[PDB]
Amino acid sequence: KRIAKAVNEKSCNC
């Protein structure tokens, strides 16, 4: 079966 990847959130350019 396929292992699921967690996504990374993108920081505010601030």
Partner 1 sequence: KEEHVIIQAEFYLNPDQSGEFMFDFDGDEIFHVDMAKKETVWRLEEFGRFASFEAQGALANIAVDKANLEIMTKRSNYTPITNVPPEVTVLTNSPVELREPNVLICFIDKFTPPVVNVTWLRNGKPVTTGVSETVFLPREDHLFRKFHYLPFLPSTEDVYDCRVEHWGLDEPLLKHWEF
Partner 2 sequence: DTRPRFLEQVKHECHFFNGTERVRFLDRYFYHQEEYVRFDSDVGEYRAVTELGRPDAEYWNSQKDLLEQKRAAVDTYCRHNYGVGESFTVQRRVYPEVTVYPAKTQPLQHHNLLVCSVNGFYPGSIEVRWFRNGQEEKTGVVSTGLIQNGDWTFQTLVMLETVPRSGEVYTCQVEHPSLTSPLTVEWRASSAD
Q: How far is the CB of 11 from partner 1 (least distance, A)?
A: 4
The phi-psi region of residue 9 (left if phi > 0; otherwise alpha if psi is between -120 and 50; otherwise beta) is beta
* Measured CA distances, 2 to 5, 6, 9, 14 (Å): 9, 13, 22, 36
Q: How far is the CB of 13 from partner 1 (least distance, A)?
A: 6
Binding site for partner 1 (CB under 8 A): 1-3, 5-13
Q: How far is the CB of 4 from partner 2 (least distance, A)?
A: 5
Q: Which residues bind partner 2 (CB under 8 A)?
A: 1-4, 6-9, 11-12, 14
